[PDB]
């Protein structure tokens, strides 16, 4: 545990849909990094990005927490969802929108 800066869960629980990557929405190569994004966006839901470089501690602090240094990483509800390969998977399948949104409580009754 890298003593210093204790607030990961919060980060992953900052925005409905969290997306950690190098460059953040700000910068994006084009694929892989931007991919997930485009998808996280294509969904139409709400999400955000974060810096994993600027905050090295977080970098490993996350991978060490999620146990998936194979960024990017998507966090939903509370448990780690997965990486692009994963995210895309859901989306592709067509079961991400309902995963991102966050179903809860009755609708009609």
UniProtKB/Swiss-Prot annotation:
Disruption phenotype: Homozygous null mutants die in utero some time between 12.5 and 14.5 dpc. 12.5 dpc embryos have a smaller body size and hemorrhage in the head. Heterozygous mutants are fertile and show no abnormalities in growth and development, cardiomyocytes exhibit significantly reduced contractility. Residues 8-103 form the Glutaredoxin domain. [2Fe-2S] cluster binds at residue 30. The thioredoxin domain lacks the two redox-active cysteines. This strongly suggests that it lacks thioredoxin activity. The chain holds residues 241 to 336 of 337 of the full protein. It is found in: Cytoplasm, Cytosol; Cytoplasm, Cell cortex; Cytoplasm, Myofibril, Sarcomere, Z line. Together with BOLA2, acts as a cytosolic iron-sulfur (Fe-S) cluster assembly factor that facilitates [2Fe-2S] cluster insertion into a subset of cytosolic proteins. Acts as a critical negative regulator of cardiac hypertrophy and a positive inotropic regulator. Required for hemoglobin maturation. Does not possess any thyoredoxin activity since it lacks the conserved motif that is essential for catalytic activity. Homodimer; the homodimer is independent of 2Fe-2S clusters. Heterotrimer; forms a heterotrimeric complex composed by two BOLA2 molecules and one GLRX3 molecule; linked by [2Fe-2S] clusters. Interacts (via N-terminus) with PRKCQ/PKC-theta. Interacts (via C-terminus) with CSRP3. Interacts with CSRP2. This is Glutaredoxin-3. The gene is Glrx3. Transgenic mice with cardiac-specific Glrx3 overexpression show that it is a potent inhibitor of cardiac hypertrophy induced by pressure overload (transverse aortic constriction). In addition, overexpression dramatically increases the ventricular function and cardiomyocyte contractility.
């Amino acid at each position: 545990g890298s003593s210093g800066s204790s607030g990961l869960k919060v980060l992953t629980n900052k925005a409905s849909v969290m997306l950690f990557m190098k460059g953040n929405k700000q910068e994006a190569k084009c694929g892989f990094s931007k991919q997930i994004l485009e998808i996280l966006n294509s969904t139409g839901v709400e999400y955000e990005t974060f810096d994993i470089l600027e905050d090295e501690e977080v970098r490993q602090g996350l991978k060490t927490f999620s146990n998936w240094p194979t960024y990017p990483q998507l966090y939903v509800r509370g448990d780690l969802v997965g990486g692009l390969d994963i995210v895309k998977e859901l989306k592709d399948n067509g079961e991400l929108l309902p995963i991102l949104k966050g179903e809860s409580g009755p609708s009609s009754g």
